[PDB]
């Protein structure tokens with residue numbers, strides 16, 4: 001596309017996009033065009049407004065575009081063209097990316113004992129309400145644990161809320177502990193674009 | 206994919222999908238899996254149910270899957286696997302395609318007079334509330350008018366309702382009437398995937 | 412989107428799109444913009460050309476846009492803006508939809524005998540090389556046969572060529588013939604957006 | 617979907633996916649199913665193979681699935697079901713995500729002088745050949761520069777190669793230098809999903 005300002009917009013929150021170069025208040029010669037999950041190619045929005053789009057996005061008195069509560073379908077491109085009192089045309093181009101932060105992840109199941117030298121199910125971590133999905137990461141004593149790296153295995157499931165579209169992640173960690181290591185290791189789970197309480201199992205030689 | 210029964214489901218209407226080979230009532234060994242606009246790959250649904258999915262699709266006592274009101278996002282694939290009393294497994298595979306019929310199309314503007322031998326704007330037709338979009342067709346004396354036929358030109362605009370996702374179509378017809386033709390032709394507009402407009406009958410000058 | 416001319420373009424065939432209002436030959440003040448399966452939002456193409464896009468679409472001397480062989484990814488929107496010798500701006504807007512016609516469908520398996528009053532597998536029809544997929548229809552004595560209509564059952568499979576993206580369809584027809592009907596019915600299969608040879612089984616009362 | 621091993625596969629490189637629990641060599645009771653950019657829902661692949669798919673993915677003697685050179689359209693889900701000698705079934709489920717690393721980013725234009733207290737165009741950075749697109753980040757004296765921070769503005773353009781589908785990024789940085797700061801700041805550009813540019817060191821006037 002064209003040169004644009006990247007905007008990250010949280011779902012459920014308002015968004016105001018500036019129409020650069022527009023007169024401070026009406027009358028203004030300006031037009032907004034957007035191409036999002038709600039449109040078939042470009043949709044034109046004018047200061048007059050009207051219709052179904054008045055429930056979604058409206059042009060404010062200062063010419064800015066206002067969305068009262070961003071949704072997944074508002075991802076896309078938003079552009080304004082305005083004329084100033086003289087007659088200079090000014091363009092504003094925005095690439096809008098939407099997101100949602102999940103709740104704190106939690107460990108829903110965990111082993112209290114691990115046996116060194118054999119594979120063990122360490123635990124299951126769940127995260128609810130992210131957009132886009134993201135992924136869950138595991139940590140050992142505060143250091144990242146790399147999946148499928150000869151001893152560490154991670155499997156993950158992604159499910160979508162049928163109405164909101166937000167993602168729930170469920171990740172399972174298996175480890176083969178090395179003999180002669182820490183007997184009370186600390187494991188934790190985090191959401192990769194917060195972190196869980198650490199679980200502290202016992203390891204046997 | 207696999208061999209499936211094609212199902213067409215109207216938006217807003219209920220849908221019942223049969224789980225072939227399931228026992229008539231509980232207990233039943235059966236499982237539904239669906240992959241639609243609402244899922245990340247396959248979602249498993251069981252007779253027990255529960256959770257957010259109970260507002261969208263639930264397994265009935267006879268093992269069928271029931272959606273109270275189909276939406277655009279229910280397009281996709283729906284499968285059941287069941288075991289009968291004897292113990293034979295039976296699979297059911299459905300490809301669900303969703304649609305909505307628009308209201309009757311309307312002519313929102315039309316010429317009352319056309320001049321033969323020059324291009325004329327005949328009229329504008331609008332259709333609201335289709336899914337998928339479809340297209341608008343023009344007719345002259347009950348015969349189809351083919352766009353871009355050296356004399357017939359058609360332009361069309363498709364807009365999407367920002368909350369329902371249903372389409373509104375707006376089509377403009379221009380024609381160059383041939384000298385020595387019908388002086389009172391009849392034009393009509395139709396929705397193409399009743400649904401035809403009242404005909405307009407302008408006057409043509411030689 | 413905006414008011415556009417709908418263009419249907421066959422895959423593998425050239426496409427020429429007119430830039431209305433452009434001067435007949437250079438120099439011309441004109442610009443093409445396209446948004447297709449090949450682009451991230453709008454891509455601008457100029458008469459000078461250059462780069463990777465010269466293998467796909469180029470502006471001709473008369474200002475028209477030329478694609479030597481349309482592919483699936485050329486579906487989308489194509490627009491031109493030009494200035495004439497005076498200075499009138501003219502816009503051209505095209506919505507391009509791509510397709511491919513399959514080969515003649517064929518019956519790959521068929522019953523030679525049907526028993527009235529019970530379900531029978533009548534036959535299997537295959538169509539190769541369509542885009543978009545389309546569907547296969549069955550006919551009895553030249554009349555359409557409606558699927559899942561208490562006596563008629565149709566199942567269909569759609570597969571995609573891994574490299575070309577063209578679709579292969581396979582449809583199976585089952586019928587429960589009505590007692591006291593035609594003893595030598597004629598069935599045929601057709602591609603719905605040609606037709607097969609009719610199969611003519613024998614029916615028993 | 618279901619519980620799966622996440623696999624990251626570089627475009628143009630081979631990929632081997634293990635069919636867990638399959639016998640080491642034929643005969644094997646196993647089946648692969650994949651749903652990717654190349655398929656309409658699930659495609660079944662067998663050890664026998666054959667057809668157009670033999671140019672893309674084939675089952676090896678040990679039952680693993682092999683793709684000689686991954687492409688963008690191989691993103692998706694790959695599953696195996698096998699039976700061992702005893703007779704136990706084992707399933708393998710993979711979620712395959714494809715990527716490509718761009719070339720080293722470059723500064724294609726830069727200011728040699730900046731004026732404190734006014735907005736200045738610092739430079740333009742370009743990255744070619746990423747998948748998915750990614751983004752370009754700017755740094756000042758090794759610290760991240762946050763866009764739209766009342767004084768820092770960044771605009772970016774993403775273009776797609778019309779035949780390979782790989783992305784080219786172009787990012788422009790503008791800053792309003794604060795009076796009384798470093799007179800020879802160092803700016804650099806980096807690719808964000810080595811891959812950092814040489815730093816530019818303009819002069820700033822008070």
Ligand SMILES: Cc1cccc2c(-c3ccccc3)c(C(=O)O)[nH]c12
Nearest residue numbers: 002031032033079080081091092093
């Ligand atoms: C490249 C670029 C950046 C910012 C705005 C625009 C507009 C536009 C937006 C609203 C109204 C009229 C024109 C256009 C166009 O459509 O030509 N291009 C733009």
Ligand SMILES: Cc1cccc2c(-c3ccccc3)c(C(=O)O)[nH]c12
Nearest residue numbers: 207236237238284285286296297298
């Ligand atoms: C090819 C085909 C047709 C109809 C149903 C299925 C199921 C299934 C559906 C629900 C529960 C368990 C299995 C599967 C599978 O997943 O193997 N394949 C199927």
Ligand SMILES: Cc1cccc2c(-c3ccccc3)c(C(=O)O)[nH]c12
Nearest residue numbers: 413442443444490491492502503504
């Ligand atoms: C609504 C409509 C119809 C046909 C062409 C255009 C262009 C355009 C195309 C190429 C170059 C410059 C402008 C624009 C725009 O971008 O404003 N809108 C258009």
Ligand SMILES: Cc1cccc2c(-c3ccccc3)c(C(=O)O)[nH]c12
Nearest residue numbers: 618647648649695696697707708709
């Ligand atoms: C949930 C899950 C994990 C891994 C493999 C499978 C298979 C499968 C794959 C290839 C062949 C036969 C079955 C199925 C199914 O289709 O039921 N479900 C699976």
Ligand SMILES: Oc1cccc(Oc2ccccc2)c1
Nearest residue numbers: 028029030031046047081082
């Ligand atoms: O929608 C509107 C409302 C008022 C004036 C207007 O005029 C412009 C058209 C295009 C670009 C800039 C200005 C457009």
Ligand SMILES: Oc1cccc(Oc2ccccc2)c1
Nearest residue numbers: 054055056057058066067068
């Ligand atoms: O975009 C919207 C959507 C709904 C209503 C609306 O009208 C307002 C007037 C004053 C304050 C806030 C909103 C504007």
Ligand SMILES: Oc1cccc(Oc2ccccc2)c1
Nearest residue numbers: 234235236251252286287288
């Ligand atoms: O035929 C099947 C296939 C898979 C599982 C199954 O067992 C279930 C019973 C109730 C609910 C969900 C699953 C029965």
Ligand SMILES: Oc1cccc(Oc2ccccc2)c1
Nearest residue numbers: 439440441442457458492493
């Ligand atoms: O790409 C080009 C090449 C030459 C002239 C030109 O000037 C225009 C810009 C936009 C619209 C119409 C004309 C654009």
Ligand SMILES: Oc1cccc(Oc2ccccc2)c1
Nearest residue numbers: 465466467468469477478479
């Ligand atoms: O769009 C293209 C693509 C490849 C080559 C090309 O150059 C030609 C010159 C003369 C005749 C035909 C083609 C134009």
Ligand SMILES: Oc1cccc(Oc2ccccc2)c1
Nearest residue numbers: 645646647662663697698699
């Ligand atoms: O474990 C399985 C699951 C499904 C089918 C199967 O039998 C096949 C043997 C060879 C090739 C394809 C299928 C074995």
Ligand SMILES: [Cl-]
Nearest residue numbers: 159160244245
């Ligand atoms: Cl899901």
Ligand SMILES: [Cl-]
Nearest residue numbers: 039040364365
């Ligand atoms: Cl729209």
Ligand SMILES: [Cl-]
Nearest residue numbers: 570571655656
């Ligand atoms: Cl397929």
Ligand SMILES: [Cl-]
Nearest residue numbers: 450451775776
């Ligand atoms: Cl592009």
